[PDB]
């Protein structure tokens, strides 16, 4: 009860209260001082926890520490020792986000007269000197400089007015380092490749510019809340502590550092001619606002209602257009590469809740943002485009599919493959997936009918009278009647063993059997699932060869080439039921039969779903092997303190299974990359021979899909890096394709 009471007290401070923040801080300080002699370690741990897991209230939690230090020097010293221990553990653990929040806490604790400025200056000197280390990854240096620069907006004035000489030396070293950094990764991370109206500059470059503007402004931001300013009278006399000499942990092979990111900028002060002047793109206030909003979203990503409530009630020293900032931060998280911090549907639901909470103003801002995003579609990345399409379709579904389509009439005259008409087509198709064709037709203007999708109806090649001359029509009719008569598998073999092979793989046989089966089971998903599961044996016996699986996939596409969702679901079931392996589907995606539909979003959602299925299967088998090994170890230790033989045998079998699963995963990724390389190389050679522009919508889509696969599965491709560089991505490769691989390598190096 004591611990939970202390936790509730500490967390409560700064929320809805009838009293001011200073009064709450003083009360909490007193209370803690009362409970100091009996819960010193408990309080220390709780404070280090709120410091490490609640960055969005950072300054508040430092003022508390600034008061306790004024009351108990010993307590302050122990606290800073514990904070340096937590920092060293987070660094040895590879928890660099927590480590940077801790560094920010120490930096702002320097402002409360807890930590002496010279000691923090020395720590920052060590941080910067990390940049002078030899043969270390550039991500380490990047992060160590980032920590310092990100902490500067909170203690920069103090550090400069105390040690301006060493501060200038630090700044000179930081500039010398930043001038020689590598920016190879920026193109793979920019949401928009266009340099106007908002360049998507790297986070370190942005932050450096902001710090330079803050220094030119005599270190004055007018945004950050500093409750300890009102306590100056009590804090000036308080004794200051000296941090022990800090040496960053040495680089190790197993250490993993955060990958560089690119600031997502889409708004401008001109976009709100009525509200408060939005902070400039290079103002430190803007960076602090985005960081606080990101932390708020990351701290409440489970409770969408509470997340919306916290976002809407975000405090600031000076009034700002908080609606625009929230929308921008939400879109930045949604459109962030490689992947968003959380599932993509969370952002949609959070935006819906935000609109519900503030219907008077926010919906207009959302519509304006949508229109902006659409106007700048000519360069947005296709991954961000897919995320935008999904979110917008879900939004329209949640708002009676109402939108001012006429405002986008400019897209009706453009090439249908242009990002704008393509985006409209995909949005309409997704809206249809959540509705019926007729409704989608009824809602769009008639002039947009050329974009509306196609009715999702089965295409039975042997249904029309003109099909009587097709080979296998009689066999098709016999199979149809047998299916209608609940025939058994052996009967179906008897009716099928009479199909004339065109020349252990009969294409006509598979084609007829699958066309008939799908056609008779083409009134509901459940029907198809039952027809696939019941006749599983026939499927596995007719499609023994990988070529047979490819033929099955091709026939399934031909039957349902108008119902992409059905195609997707069917392929999923076929790969889970083991009718087709993932390699066959991967080969099918790049097959010529999909060239006309190669750029359509459903083929890539299918490919990604198959990759995810393979990854999950491998992870499950590995986890089972780990559990079996743990059980073996526990049993052996308990016995030491037949069965063993058979268990060890099992373990061996599981290990072989894990090896085979990893081999299949590797083969899947290798085949995918080979097919990407082949298509891009042949396209580039043909374009060069023709002397035409290499930048075409198809090329952009393919290259950015390759980038999407690399970004999505870097975690696994890190293992194959060696073979990828030795076999696939070689020097002889075309520079355009090799550029993607170089960017991916530089992403974490």
């Amino acid at each position: 009860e004591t611990e939970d009471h202390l936790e509730s007290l500490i967390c409560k401070v700064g929320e809805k209260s009838a009293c001011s923040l200073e009064s709450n801080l003083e009360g909490l300080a007193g209370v803690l001082e009362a409970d100091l002699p009996n819960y010193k370690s408990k309080i220390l741990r709780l404070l280090c926890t709120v410091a490490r897991l609640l960055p969005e209230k950072l300054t508040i939690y430092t003022t508390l520490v600034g008061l306790l230090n004024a009351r108990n020097y010993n307590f302050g010293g122990e606290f800073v020792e514990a904070m340096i221990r937590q920092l060293k553990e987070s660094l040895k653990a590879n928890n660099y986000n927590e480590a940077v929040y801790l560094v920010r806490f120490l930096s702002d604790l320097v402002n409360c007269h807890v930590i002496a400025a010279p000691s923090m200056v020395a720590m920052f000197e060590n941080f910067v000197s990390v940049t002078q280390e030899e043969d270390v990854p550039q991500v380490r240096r990047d992060w160590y400089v980032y920590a310092f620069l990100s902490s500067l907006p909170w203690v920069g004035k103090e550090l400069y007015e105390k040690k301006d000489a060493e501060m200038d030396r630090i700044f000179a070293n930081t500039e010398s380092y930043l001038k020689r950094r590598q920016k190879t990764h920026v193109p793979m991370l920019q949401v928009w490749t266009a340099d106007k109206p908002h360049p998507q500059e790297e986070y370190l470059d942005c932050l450096w510019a902001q710090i330079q503007k803050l220094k030119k402004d005599r270190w004055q931001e007018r945004h950050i809340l500093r409750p300890y300013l009102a306590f100056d009278s009590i804090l000036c006399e308080a004794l200051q502590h000296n941090l022990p000499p800090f040496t960053p942990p040495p680089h190790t092979e197993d250490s993993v550092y955060p990958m560089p990111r690119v600031i997502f900028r889409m708004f401008d002060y001109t976009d709100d001619p009525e509200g408060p002047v939005m902070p400039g793109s290079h103002s430190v206030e803007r960076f602090v606002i985005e960081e606080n909003l990101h932390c708020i979203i990351k701290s409440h990503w489970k409770e969408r209602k509470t997340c919306a409530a916290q976002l809407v009630s975000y405090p600031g020293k000076n009034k700002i257009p908080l609606n625009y900032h929230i929308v921008e931060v939400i879109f930045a998280e949604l459109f962030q590469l490689p992947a968003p911090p959380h599932i993509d549907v969370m952002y949609t639901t959070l935006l819906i809740e935000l609109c519900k909470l503030q219907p008077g103003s926010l919906p207009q801002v959302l519509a304006q943002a949508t229109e902006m995003l659409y106007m700048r579609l000519d360069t947005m990345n296709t991954t961000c485009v897919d995320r935008f399409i999904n979110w917008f379709s879900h939004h329209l579904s949640n708002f009676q599919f109402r939108w001012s389509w006429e405002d986008w009439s400019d897209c009706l005259s453009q090439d249908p493959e242009s990002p704008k008409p393509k985006f409209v087509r995909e949005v309409l198709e997704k809206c249809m997936r959540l509705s019926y064709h007729q409704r989608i037709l009824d809602i769009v203007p008639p002039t947009f009918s050329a974009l509306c999708p196609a009715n999702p109806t089965c295409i039975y090649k042997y249904g029309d009278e003109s099909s009587n001359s097709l080979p296998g029509h009689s066999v098709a009719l016999c199979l149809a009647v047998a299916f209608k008569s609940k025939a058994t598998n052996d009967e179906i073999f008897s009716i099928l063993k009479d199909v004339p092979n065109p020349n252990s793989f009969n294409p006509l046989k598979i084609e007829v059997f699958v066309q008939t089966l799908l056609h008779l089971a083409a009134k509901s998903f459940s029907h198809s699932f039952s027809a696939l599961a019941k006749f599983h044996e026939v499927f596995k016996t007719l499609a023994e060869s990988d070529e047979g699986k490819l033929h099955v996939l091709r026939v399934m596409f031909e039957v349902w080439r108008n119902h992409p969702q059905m195609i997707a679901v069917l392929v999923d079931k076929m790969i889970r039921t083991q009718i087709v392996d993932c390699a066959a589907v991967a080969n099918w995606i790049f097959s010529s039969e999909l060239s006309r539909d190669f750029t359509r979003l459903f083929v890539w959602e299918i490919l990604h779903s198959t990759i995810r299925k393979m990854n999950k299967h491998v992870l499950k088998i590995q986890k089972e092997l780990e559990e079996a090994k743990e059980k073996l170890a526990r049993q052996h230790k308990r016995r030491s303190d037949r069965k063993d033989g058979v268990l060890e045998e099992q373990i061996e079998r599981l290990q072989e299974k894990v090896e085979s699963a990893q081999s299949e995963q590797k083969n899947l990724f290798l085949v995918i990359f080979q097919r990407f390389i082949m298509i891009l190389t042949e396209h580039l050679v043909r374009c060069e021979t023709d002397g035409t522009s290499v930048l075409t919508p198809w090329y952009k889509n393919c290259i950015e899909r390759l980038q999407q696969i690399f970004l999505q599965h870097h975690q696994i491709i890190q293992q194959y890096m060696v073979t990828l560089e030795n076999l696939l991505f070689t020097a002889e490769l075309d520079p355009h394709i090799l550029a993607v691989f170089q960017q991916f390598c530089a992403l974490q190096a």
Partner: peptide, 20 residues
């Protein structure tokens, strides 16, 4: 021109919810 289509949609949905 402030596109307020979704403000109208939210107003209609709230009216329907009140009617229900």
């Amino acid at each position: 021109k402030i596109n307020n289509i979704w403000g109208a949609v939210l107003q209609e949905q709230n009216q329907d919810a009140v009617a229900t």
